[PDB]
């Protein structure tokens, strides 16, 4: 709820699950990965592009 | 064969319906439930035909 009720970020599109009720499933593993790019290429964070 | 058929994803996110319901949002859910319903129906019809 800290992350998905902070609206300051620009894109929140979740695959295979859904944001609002992510607070429902209990997870095996979560990997956090970060990087820096241009804001053109937010389409290239996508399956099949 | 009929019982085992329940274990196949049939193209959806996951086989177990209690997880598809409890994972995706409704407006998204309908999609992933659709292929599951059609697959299980076709299996049931083959069973009754034999």
UniProtKB/Swiss-Prot annotation, chain A:
Subunit structure: Binds to host ACE2. RBD also interacts with the N-linked glycan on 'Asn-90' of ACE2. Cleavage of S generates a polybasic C-terminal sequence on S1 that binds to host Neuropilin-1 (NRP1) and Neuropilin-2 (NRP2) receptors. Interacts with host integrin alpha-5/beta-1 (ITGA5:ITGB1) and with ACE2 in complex with integrin alpha-5/beta-1 (ITGA5:ITGB1). May interact via cytoplasmic c-terminus with M protein. May interact (via N-terminus) with host bilirubin and biliverdin, thereby preventing antibody binding to the SARS-CoV-2 spike NTD via an allosteric mechanism.
Function in brief: Attaches the virion to the cell membrane by interacting with host receptor, initiating the infection. The major receptor is host ACE2. When S2/S2' has been cleaved, binding to the receptor triggers direct fusion at the cell membrane. When S2/S2' has not been cleaved, binding to the receptor results in internalization of the virus by endocytosis using host TFRC and GRM2 and leading to fusion of the virion membrane with the host endosomal membrane. Alternatively, may use NRP1/NRP2 and integrin as entry receptors.
Region feature Integrin-binding motif, mapped onto this chain: 38-40
Part of the whole protein covered: 366 to 414 of 1273
Protein's UniProt name: Spike protein S1
UniProtKB/Swiss-Prot annotation, chain B:
Variant or mutagenesis effect after changing residue 9 to K: In strain: Omicron/BA.1, Omicron/BA.2, Omicron/BA.2.12.1, Omicron/BA.2.75, Omicron/BA.4, Omicron/BA.5, Omicron/BQ.1.1, Omicron/XBB.1.5, Omicron/EG.5.1
Coiled-coil portions: 1-33
Domain of life according to the entry: Viruses
Described purpose of this protein according to its UniProt entry: Subunit of the fusion protein that is processed upon entry into the host cell. Mediates fusion of the virion and cellular membranes by functioning as a class I viral fusion protein. Contains a viral fusion peptide that is unmasked after S2 cleavage. This cleavage can occur at the cell membrane by host TMPRSS2 or during endocytosis by host CSTL. In either case, this triggers an extensive and irreversible conformational change that leads to fusion of the viral envelope with the cellular cytoplasmic membrane, releasing viral genomic RNA into the host cell cytoplasm.
Protein name: Spike protein S2'
Gene: S
């Amino acid at each position: 709820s800290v992350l998905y009720n902070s609206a300051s970020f620009s894109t929140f599109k979740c695959y295979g699950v859904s944001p609002t009720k992510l607070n429902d499933l209990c997870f095996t593993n979560v990997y956090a990965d970060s990087f820096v790019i241009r804001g053109d290429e937010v389409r290239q964070i996508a399956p099949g592009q | 064969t009929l019982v085992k058929q329940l274990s196949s994803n049939f193209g959806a996110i996951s086989s177990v319906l209690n997880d598809i319901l409890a994972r995706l949002d409704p407006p998204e859910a309908e999609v992933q439930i659709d292929r599951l319903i059609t697959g299980r129906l076709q299996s049931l019809q083959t069973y009754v035909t034999q």
